[PDB]
């Protein structure tokens, strides 16, 4: 949903001693102990263009280019 | 390595692309890993033709006929287009282009520049199509392995061997026990009773070592899901287990097994499919432990029966020359045309003629029920037009008749006559034309487009990569 | 439960029980008492079952102890009232007799027990004859005994006639066969009935044997239900069902859907003495009931029917097929006991379960896998049709039912194979089901004979075959049966159609006779009748010919309800249920019905009522109103009832496709298919002529309109129209309509110029009257057939004109006008003389702004006609063709009319044209009309549809809102929707305009709306015109630099120069929304003026440049990637040299011009210096001041920030930013409207955002616009629109400068009291609704500010926020996709200005970048 997005764009309100961000309506506080991961598991799903372009995009998606990888190591180990 | 890393992508890539054509088609990187380990326990040149012929040898077990013989060609091409000239390349496509309908041309001839390659066009142009599909396979120079020698290799526990309607490994699993270790159990899963009996044989079997066979879970399967795919998964104390193995029969055609489950198990296709005579053999072959209820002349309308089914099985599988559509006939079919057949000698008398509505209830509601199909519906009457009505001789084929039955009247005798006029014919090589009653330029037709529809996937899957 | 607590409870009462019963027996409906003691009961046929011992009750009894002595007694009871019967009829009594004493299911066995007794003997003697005879007079003993009976008895003669036949039938059969085999051989397939003369326990007595095998008749009673005619096939589904059950398997068919299936389920189950449950599956059916039905299934030895069970949720119909699975292995075992739904319960051996299984869309269903080895799976088929017929031959009235049967279905046979396959053609055996059916009535009329087939053949069959088909019919009907030379009802019922025509105008055709006569004989069989053909066929006018001709000739009265079907929705039409409080409130086709069967207050019995759908018609909406189709003829209440329906009320449908129906709705109705129009092209124009003349008679006197009529006939004769008419055709049609229905768009306007100028009629030369007549006929007669037309091809036609009408007659020319004297009676024909504009600088731009054309005239002249004449313009042209200014200039001038603007877009809603209207129209209950909606002020006003052309269509395709104007022109009042009455439209008029529909985002409209439109082609005027136009425009606005006078001609020709060529060089081919009109001519125009209007004195090196900066950012601006920007650079560069030619121009591009007031208090050409420090001490500001975002001030920067700075400046300020993403769009425009002071406004949207909510946020952002005075800016991002409404929203905000929906009703009145506080605040008072409101609209119209943020226009959503018009043309485009190698190196740089490096070989810091 849209409403996580200012938390997407590192979007706040510097206050007095707190920082303020906007979500939906309510204006509430951060931490800064506070993260934030996003986790999908389709690669056929396809994400919004706002979250895509600020996003760390990292694919752990066990391949068939992952397959030319590892074939060298397990022949080298039966050849020298 | 590159170079073998390259081409065994290409063939990963072309085992996965079956996967998506069919659900039973899976296979997993480590299946892929497994397989290259076995192929150490112009050096490179020989380890990758190593790989080409265990890959064949391994996943060609998974996949049915039809996925063999196109992953030959596939795999074939995958290397040799690599490996041999570019003049090489197109003079085994165009051929390829032949044996679909994509083109029809003449390849590229030196005089023993080619020799394999000159044999090859020479099964195109032969018009003969099923040597020149297995010619793909048989270039692999692998031994090509039995369900038998696949399970004494495999190093697992649990085995899941689909098949089509037509048959069911069932009978080969005892065989197969039988041969070596023994050991074997067959559990119906039916009804809560079958399924709750079943749950019980199963944890008590593995602890006892015995083999275990789950006949069409498919049926069954709201609960595999449920118990069977976390009570396998959890069973990795099977590994601790004493030797036992456990078998599953799917059927290829009908409801999806959870992915999980299938990748975890090894995987079978039956495809083992038996002459008209064996058949004959095989039906009749059970009909003497019933006992006896009936007349001795009924005997001989349950031989008729075993020749009858055994003919329209046999035709089920050519379409769309011989019926429309596929068809299948069960044992079912079978039990409830030999009922008819003891109920209209129960209420009858021995005279011969009550034959008429024999006919008409064997060809319209007992076989004919599930025809919907004018054309095909014909089919099935002609059938019976020619196996039931016969006075004194019938001559089901044209090497075999079987006469009336004789005034000695003998029960014992008349099973051993007839089992002896089996025992006296020999099945000639061309059964589906002289048999079926059907032409041999129909029987061509038909290997024709099974020809095709190899070469066809084939093109196209290169193409995709 | 709830019914169980009920009978529990009411043991006190015991009568009560008798409403359960028709639920837990199926057969019987109410149960008889003599209150201590039970009677009998009766059936839900009403059939009356009476018992051997009444059952005794008393006060300590329980429904369950006195019901099951119930159950017992009631089979008892069957099998006496059977041996008494069998015995009876043994003893040789006439059926008839047994009829008026026994029950049916009684009679029925024993008639099934004697007849196979009878002929199992006959087949030994072969006597069949003598039993055949027999038997058949027993039949037409029964039939006539029938006509005589009442209706009770009625039922049991019918039913039993189904019987008797398949007994005679069997007989002849089996008489008929070669040898003994052979009858013995269908013997064995029959069901044969009999009874055991050996033993006890009698209601086990009766058996059945089917095949060999037998099954026992249990006594259940099942009431007298519709018997199902015997057929082959029937035999054969009795035959499978016997066999899976003798061997312990259920029965399972699966097929099409109308097989009937479950039929044959439930028949078989009667035929032995069975009442089978049958459950509707899936019809949000519960689990929970099933599994408590399949208990009691097993318990009380039931048959059960899946009717239709493969459409199951899959987790229910695993549960259920589990559960049944139960029951199959039960039995075919014979366990005692099985287990099912986790509880020992027992079961009965009789039990049976049977599947039916209807087709998926993938295929034939199938059974799950558990259940195909304890099913037999059968496939049904439709029956071989020849056998059915004869029977029903039979049924009414045989004469020789045998050879009539087989004439029939050969002859359907052979039509099939004979004519053109064509879409609506079914000869399969619903139609001579339909054939048979019509054949009843008819009967009455002549014979049981073949005659009556003959007719009856003609009557469905011919009048849905057209022209070619038309014969093959006649060839091969005469070909295969002759039966008569005469019709009667010949001479009576055409006396009453000649004269019911004479009277409402039209001609008695040979066509509109048939199409009549069509008519007539099928309404008299059927009470739906469909009519189908194009526009202008006649339909409308051959039914309202034949009903009124009906009035004359029964003297009944009719009543017509015309209903345009798909105007309204289901629920608006048939009865809409509302979703919490469950109230049921009528609707349109069920309330008009209740007038006629609820309350006939007046006179309805002598009356007749007709329901006509004039609208497309639907499955959706047919599929409601199946049952009245059906031989059921009552209305099916998705709540609350069933209404019957009455003789008197007939359905129609007129329409002109009929691809959307089912073959199934085609052939319960009458079918009348209009091959070509009924009428000749003269003899429409004659009755149009009439229709209009009589307009005329109120407002002319018949010494002027007797002389108008005679001037009429001998100017245009048909001798010379009809090669005009045929060379309409050769000619390019924009907005195609046939040649047909452009004729009255003639007629119209032909009698209204010529009623024109009837003044100087009366006393000009005889000679000279003829040349005005003549041509403004030609005048006239151009617009009706080339007004869609190129004009180039206009002008091709005029020639074409003259040439057909005789030489000398006065000559068409292309500006051909006709002028008299302001106080003096002249005559002169003089044309093309106009005025001329004088303009001051502030008035340049202006709404209402027109620079009187040689063209500008000419349309305004015509279009203007046309509204005389009263009939719906539709203006057909490209964007900026200036079809909305002519129209409304033409109108915004004269005191007649006044104006209404309608903005259309992708969805618009047929309130949307009514809530419109609700300002300006006023309702009045004149008993004259009824109610009205006539304009709220006394004179004319004019509904203007923009772009009617763009609301989309149902997924059948049928727009709804053009069915709506198409009602509202043709019909002239509609149907309110919720309300439901009729309100006449007075005095309101329709015009439209739209695009070519070879356009993209265009909606072709149906032929049957258009035909009653004058439409006109406008196009681009020039590029000569245009040039000297906007001369004229640059006239007005260098009144502020007037020592630049004479450049204005350079200027204006330099202007068009730009615009010819950026409309060629950049075309929709490279990018969609490449697309320039002469509004980008006007926009620059009016840029020009205002950077003047607001800047220091101007030397032509400024001028100049001020033209170029507008001229960027008005052509420029949307062009993608920089090929064709720098073409843009080299054009304006290439149009300067050859128009303006100085020496003193410098850098054109858009990054060395910069014009600003930021700096200046004057709009002024800033330094790129000065302007980049001003915006870096202004961002620091905004930066610290409102959200912490930082960014790199950049030379594209600068150059966008004067782009949006322009935009946000001007009234209506819309800009469309196309930015990729992370370049800045967002961010550069809350800057903008911030350095502007400008409320930032972006709607709140997410994942659960309803429309209500940007509803929300939009209505609280326009009464702050106006209400508070804000000057918000609205950003929206392509994110935001989550549905297709929302944009559809946004439009509405653009086009129109409101929301109306917003502001509706009470919502209405609120704003418009809130308006009237804050505008006497301001200090005026505003007296009428209107005039607040225009303030209200034109306060949004310049405070809010629409920003439009699209990342990848590829997209097809974000595609069409750029597609929708409302957007594209109140929006400024701007291109910010792709950031330059120069902006970036400028980025990377101020970003790498952090410096840890140090120096290296080579700059480093300059490497680092350029890596
Ligand atoms: N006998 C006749 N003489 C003169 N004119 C006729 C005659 N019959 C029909 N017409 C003309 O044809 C028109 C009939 O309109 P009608 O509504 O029947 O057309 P339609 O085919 O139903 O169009 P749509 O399909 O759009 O409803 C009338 O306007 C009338 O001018
Ligand atoms: N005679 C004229 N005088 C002034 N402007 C004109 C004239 N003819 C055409 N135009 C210009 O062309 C445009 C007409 O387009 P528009 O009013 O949108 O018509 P339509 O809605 O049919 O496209 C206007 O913007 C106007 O500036
Ligand atoms: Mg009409």
């Not at chain 3, 009935?193 to 259940?220: A, H, M, P, R, W």
């Not at chain 3, 299984?357 to 496939?379: D, V």
């Not at chain 3, 003609?458 to 091969?476: A, N």
């Not at chain 3, 204005?1048 to 950026?1062: D, G, I, K, M």
């Amino acid at each position: 949903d849209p409403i996580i997005s200012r938390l997407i764009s590192r979007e706040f309100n510097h206050a007095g001693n707190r920082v303020t961000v906007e979500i939906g309506d309510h204006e509430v506080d951060v931490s800064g102990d506070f993260k934030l991961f996003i986790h999908s598991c389709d690669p056929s799903g396809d994400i919004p263009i706002f979250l895509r372009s600020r996003v760390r995009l990292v694919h752990f998606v066990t391949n068939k280019e992952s397959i030319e990888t590892r074939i060298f190591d397990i022949t080298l180990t039966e050849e020298n | 390595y590159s170079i073998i890393g390259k081409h065994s992508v290409k063939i990963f890539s072309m085992l996965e692309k079956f996967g998506q054509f069919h659900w039973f088609y899976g296979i997993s990187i480590g299946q892929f890993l497994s397989c290259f380990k076995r192929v150490f326990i112009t050096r490179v040149d020989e380890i990758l033709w190593l790989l080409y012929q265990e890959v064949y040898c391994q996943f060609s077990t998974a996949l049915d006929k039809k996925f063999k013989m196109i992953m030959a060609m596939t795999m074939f091409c995958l290397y040799k287009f690599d490996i041999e000239s570019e003049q090489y390349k197109e003079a085994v496509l165009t051929m390829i282009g032949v044996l679909s309908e994509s083109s029809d041309g003449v390849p590229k001839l030196t005089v023993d520049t080619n020799n394999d390659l000159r044999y090859l066009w020479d099964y195109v142009t032969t018009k003969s199509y099923i040597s020149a599909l297995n010619w793909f396979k048989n270039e692999f120079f692998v031994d090509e392995w039995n369900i038998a020698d696949v399970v004494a290799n495999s190093d697992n526990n649990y085995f899941t061997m689909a098949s089509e309607r037509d048959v069911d490994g069932t009978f080969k699993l005892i065989e197969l026990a039988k041969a070596s270790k023994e050991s074997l159990k067959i559990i119906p899963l039916g009804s809560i009773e079958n399924l709750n009996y079943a749950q019980e044989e199963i944890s008590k079997s593995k602890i006892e070592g015995g083999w275990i066979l789950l006949q069409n879970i498919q049926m069954s399967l709201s609960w595999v899901k449920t118990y069977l795919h976390k009570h396998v998964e959890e069973t990795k104390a099977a590994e601790e287990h004493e030797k036992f193995k456990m078998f599953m029969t799917c059927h290829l055609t009908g409801d999806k097994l959870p992915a999980p489950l299938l990748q975890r198990t090894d995987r079978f296709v039956y495809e083992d499919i038996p002459g008209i005579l064996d058949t004959v053999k095989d039906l009749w072959g059970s009909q003497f432990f019933t006992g006896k209820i009936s007349g001795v002349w009924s005997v001989y309308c349950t031989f008729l029966l075993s020749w009858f089914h055994a003919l329209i099985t046999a035709r089920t599988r050519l379409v769309p020359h011989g019926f429309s559509k596929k068809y299948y006939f069960n044992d079912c079919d079978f039990q409830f045309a030999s009922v008819y057949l003891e109920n209209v000698l129960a209420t009858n008398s021995t005279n011969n003629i009550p034959w008429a509505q024999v006919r008409d209830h064997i060809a319209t509601i007992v076989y004919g029920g599930k025809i919907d199909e004018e054309k095909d519906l014909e089919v099935v009457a002609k059938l019976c037009a020619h196996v039931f009505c016969g006075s004194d001789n019938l001559q089901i084929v044209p090497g075999v008749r079987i006469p009336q039955p004789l005034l000695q009247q003998s029960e014992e005798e008349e099973r051993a006559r007839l089992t002896a006029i089996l025992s006296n014919t020999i099945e000639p090589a061309d059964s589906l034309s002289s048999w079926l009653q059907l032409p041999r330029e129909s029987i061509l037709n038909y290997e024709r487009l099974q020809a095709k529809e190899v070469a066809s996937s084939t093109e196209q899957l290169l193409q995709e990569m | 439960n709830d019914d169980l607590l009920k009978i529990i409870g009411s043991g006190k009462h015991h009568d009560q029980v008798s409403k359960f019963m028709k639920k837990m027996f199926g057969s019987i409906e109410s149960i008889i008492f003599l209150e201590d003691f039970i009677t009998g009961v009766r059936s839900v046929e009403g059939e009356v079952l009476n018992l051997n011992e009444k059952i005794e009750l008393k006060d300590s009894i329980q429904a369950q102890e006195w019901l099951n002595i119930l159950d017992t007694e009631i089979k008892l009871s069957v099998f006496t009232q059977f041996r008494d019967c069998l015995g009876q009829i043994k003893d040789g009594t006439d059926i008839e007799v047994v009829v008026s004493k026994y029950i049916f299911q009684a009679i029925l066995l024993s008639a099934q027990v004697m007849w196979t007794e009878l002929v199992e003997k006959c087949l030994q003697t072969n006597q069949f004859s003598k039993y055949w005879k027999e038997v058949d007079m027993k039949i037409k003993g029964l039939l006539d005994k029938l006509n005589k009976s009442s209706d009770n008895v009625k039922k049991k003669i019918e039913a039993l006639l189904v019987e008797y036949l398949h007994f005679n039938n069997v007989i002849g059969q089996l008489k008929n066969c070669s040898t003994k085999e052979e009858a013995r051989l269908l013997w064995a397939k029959v069901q044969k009935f009999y009874q055991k003369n050996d033993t006890l326990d009698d209601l086990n007595s009766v058996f059945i044997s089917q095949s060999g095998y037998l099954l026992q008749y249990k006594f259940e009673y099942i009431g007298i239900p519709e018997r199902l005619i015997y057929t082959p096939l029937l035999l054969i589904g009795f035959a499978t069902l016997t066999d899976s059950l003798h061997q312990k398997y259920g029965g399972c068919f699966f097929g099409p859907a109308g097989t009937g299936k479950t039929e044959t389920v439930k028949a078989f189950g009667q035929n032995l003495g069975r009442v089978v449950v049958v459950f509707n599956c899936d019809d949000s059916f519960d689990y929970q009931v099933l599994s408590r039905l399949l208990v009691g299934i097993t318990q009380i030895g039931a048959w059960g029917c899946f009717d239709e069970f493969n459409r199951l949720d899959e987790k229910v119909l695993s549960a259920v097929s589990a559960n049944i699975q139960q029951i199959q292995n039960g039995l075919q075992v014979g366990k005692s006991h099985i287990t099912l739904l986790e509880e020992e319960t027992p079961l009965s051996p009789h039990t049976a379960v049977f599947i039916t299984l209807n087709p998926g869309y993938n295929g034939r269903s199938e059974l799950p896998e558990n259940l195909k080895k304890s099913f037999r799976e059968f496939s049904m088929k439709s029956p071989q049709s020849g056998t059915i017929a004869e029977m029903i031959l039979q049924i009414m009235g045989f004469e020789d039912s045998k050879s009539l049967a087989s004439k029939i279905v050969h002859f359907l046979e052979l039509l099939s194979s004979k004519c053109s396959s064509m879409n609506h053609y079914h000869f399969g055996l619903r139609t001579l089901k339909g054939v048979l059916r019509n054949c009843s009535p008819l009967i009455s009329e002549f014979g049981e004979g073949e005659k009556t087939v003959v007719e009856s053949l003609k009557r469905v069959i011919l009048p849905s075959l057209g022209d070619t088909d038309e014969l093959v019919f006649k060839d091969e009907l005469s070909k295969i049966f002759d039966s008569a030379g005469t019709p009667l009802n010949s001479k009576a019922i055409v006396q009453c159609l000649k004269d019911a025509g004479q009277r409402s105008g039209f001609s008695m055709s040979e066509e509109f006779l048939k199409k009549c006569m069509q008519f007539y004989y099928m309404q008299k069989t059927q009470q739906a009748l469909i009519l189908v053909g194009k526009a202008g066929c006649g339909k409308t006018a051959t039914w309202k010919t034949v009903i009124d001709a009906m009035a004359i000739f029964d003297g009944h009265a009719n009543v017509v309800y015309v209903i345009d079907t798909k105007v309204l929705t289901k629920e608006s039409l048939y009865g809409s249920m509302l979703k919490a409080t469950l109230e049921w409130r009528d609707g349109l086709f069920t309330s008009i019905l209740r007038r006629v069967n609820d309350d006939i207050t007046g006179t309805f019995k002598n009356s007749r009522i007709w329901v006509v759908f004039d609208s497309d018609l639907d499955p959706e909406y047919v599929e409601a109103m199946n049952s009245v189709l059906d031989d059921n003829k009552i209305l099916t209440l998705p709540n609350g009832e069933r209404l019957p329906i009455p003789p008197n009320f007939r359905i129609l449908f007129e329409t002109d496709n009929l691809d959307h129906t089912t073959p199934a709705t085609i052939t319960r109705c009458g079918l009348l298919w209009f091959s070509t129009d009924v009428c000749s092209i003269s003899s429409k124009i004659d009755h149009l002529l009439n229709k209009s003349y009589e307009a005329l008679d109120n407002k002319l006197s018949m010494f002027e309109l007797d002389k108008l009529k005679d001037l009429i006939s001998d100017s245009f004769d048909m001798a010379s129209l009809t090669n005009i008419f045929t060379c309409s055709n050769d000619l390019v049609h924009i907005l195609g309509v046939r040649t047909f229905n452009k004729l009255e768009t003639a007629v119209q306007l032909a009698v209204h110029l010529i009623s024109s100028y009837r003044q100087w009629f009366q006393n000009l030369d005889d000679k000279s009257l003829k040349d005005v007549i003549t041509l403004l006929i030609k005048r006239s007669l151009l617009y009706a057939l080339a007004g869609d037309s190129t004009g180039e091809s206009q002008r091709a036609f005029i020639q074409t004109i003259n040439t057909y009408f005789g030489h000398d007659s006065q000559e068409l020319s292309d500006y051909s006008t006709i002028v008299i004297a302001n106080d003096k009676l002249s005559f002169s024909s003089f044309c093309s003389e106009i005025p001329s504009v004088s303009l001051e600088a502030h008035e340049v731009m202006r709404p209402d702004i027109v620079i009187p054309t040689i063209d500008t005239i000419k349309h305004e002249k015509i279009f203007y006609d046309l509204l005389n004449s009263k009939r719906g313009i539709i203006l057909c042209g490209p964007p900026g063709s200036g079809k909305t200014m002519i129209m409304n200039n033409a109108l915004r001038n004269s005191s007649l009319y006044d104006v209404v603007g309608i903005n259309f877009s992708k969805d618009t809603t047929t309130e949307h044209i009514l809530s419109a209207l609700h300002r300006h129209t006023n309702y009045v209950t004149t008993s004259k009309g009824l109610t009205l909606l006539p304009k709220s002020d006394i004179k004319n006003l004019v509904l203007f549809c923009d772009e009617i052309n763009l609301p989309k269509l149902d997924k059948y395709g049928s727009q709804n809102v053009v069915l709506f104007l198409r009602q509202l022109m043709e019909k002239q009042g509609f149907w309110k929707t919720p309300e439901n009455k009729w309100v006449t439209i007075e005095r309101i008029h329709i015009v439209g305009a739209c695009n070519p529909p070879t356009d993209p985002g265009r909606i072709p409209m149906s032929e049957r709306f258009t035909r009653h439109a004058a439409i006109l082609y406008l196009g681009y005027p020039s590029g000569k015109s245009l040039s000297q136009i906007y001369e004229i425009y640059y006239k007005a606005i260098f009144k502020l630099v007037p020592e630049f006078r004479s450049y204005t001609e350079p200027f204006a020709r330099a202007s068009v120069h730009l615009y010819n060529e950026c409309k060629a060089r950049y075309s929709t081919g490279l990018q969609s929304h490449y697309l320039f009109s002469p509004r980008e001519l006007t926009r620059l125009v009016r840029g020009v003026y205002t950077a003047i209007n607001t800047g220091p004195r101007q030397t032509l090196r400024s001028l100049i440049r001020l033209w170029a900066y507008e001229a960027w950012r008005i052509f420029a601006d949307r062009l993608v990637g920089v090929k064709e920007k720098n073409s843009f650079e080299q054009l304006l560069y290439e149009t300067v040299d050859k128009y303006l030619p100085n020496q003193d121009l410098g850098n054109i591009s858009s990054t060395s011009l910069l014009f600003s007031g930021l700096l200046s208090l004057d709009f002024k050409e800033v330094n790129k210096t000065d302007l980049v420090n001003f915006i870096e001490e202004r961002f620091k500001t905004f930066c610290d001041e409102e959200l912490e975002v930082p960014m790199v001030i950049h030379e594209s920067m600068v150059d966008h920030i004067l782009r949006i700075d322009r935009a946000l400046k001007q009234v209506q300020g819309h800009m469309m930013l196309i930015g990729a993403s992370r370049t800045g769009k967002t961010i550069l425009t809350r800057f903008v409207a911030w350095l502007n002071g400008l409320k930032i406004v972006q709607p709140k949207i997410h994942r659960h955002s309803n429309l209500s909510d940007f509803d929300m946020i939009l209505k609280k952002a326009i009464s702050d616009c106006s209400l508070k005075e804000s000057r918000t800016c609205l950003i929206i991002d392509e994110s935001n629109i989550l549905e297709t409404a929302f944009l559809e929203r946004m439009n509405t905000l653009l086009a129109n400068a409101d929301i109306p929906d917003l502001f509706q009703g009470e919502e209405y009145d609120k704003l418009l009291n809130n308006l009237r506080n804050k505008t006497r605040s301001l200090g005026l008072l505003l007296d009428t609704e209107q005039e607040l409101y225009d303030w209200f609209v034109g306060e949004i119209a310049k405070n809010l500010h629409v920003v439009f943020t699209i990342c990848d226009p590829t997209n097809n959503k974000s595609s069409a926020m750029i597609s929708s018009p409302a957007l594209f043309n109140r929006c400024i485009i701007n291109w910010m996709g792709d950031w330059d190698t120069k902006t970036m190196s400028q980025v990377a740089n101020n970003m790498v200005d952090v410096i840890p490096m140090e120096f290296t070989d080579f700059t480093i810091r300059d490497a680092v970048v350029n890596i």
